[PDB]
Structure formats: C-alpha cells, structure tokens
Amino acid sequence: FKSELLAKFVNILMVDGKKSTAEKIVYTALDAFEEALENVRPAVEVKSRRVGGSTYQVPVEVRPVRRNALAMRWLVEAARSMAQRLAAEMLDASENKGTAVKKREDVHRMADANKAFAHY
C-alpha cells in the first residue's frame, strides 16, 4: 500500500520478529483504516506528576504522532483467527463501537474528570 502508518500498524502488530505473519494478517483483514484510526486517535490524555507530595492525574494534549500511535496500539490490543478479529475491531472502529473506541472514550472521560488540574 506504500504507507508509513501502515508499516507502523503491522510493526505494532508484529510479535517476536515475525513481520511476515503480521504483514499477512493486516494485509488480509485490510482486504476485508485511515478513517477507523481517526475515530480512535485521542486528542487528550491524563499523565501523572509528583505535584509537591501527591500523585495527580493531569490532562495533557497528545501530539499528532503519538495520536496515530496510541490509536494503532488500541486497535491491535482490542483486536487481539486474527484477520477474523482485526477487521472485526477495525470496522466497529469506523462505527464508533468496540474497545479501541471505548479507549478514546474512557481516556477522554478521565481527562474531562481531571480538567480541574489542566494547567497547574
């Protein structure tokens, strides 16, 4: 397909050096992305600081690169045959359903709940 994000996705899917097994899986279930990714990409995430003497979950922006990377990770981790689990997720991911979308949600939820720490 000749796309660096696709390269990433398989390497994020790849296990134990096995690029072929991965590459097949992704390529086959793709036969059955750029959208379904963009509906998992999180804009906001909580981090954590030693604030002085406690641990507070502080909202921060996700930068666009980590945005695509966190999405891929979430798809794969939810998704985890595999091609009969990697289109399964990565279609519900275009239909704002599943667990990769639940991530985007439950992350934004946590950030929304921590807006009181946004900039301090």
Binding site: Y56, K115, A116, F117, A118, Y120
Partner: peptide, 12 residues
C-alpha cells in the same frame, strides 16, 4: 461537583 482538592482550582 468538585470536592476537597479540586474545589480550590480556577476551573471549579
């Protein structure tokens, strides 16, 4: 909504 620590924030 906010209680304890988060009351004492601008955003609350």
């Amino acid at each position: 909504g906010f209680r304890g620590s988060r009351k004492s924030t601008p955003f609350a």
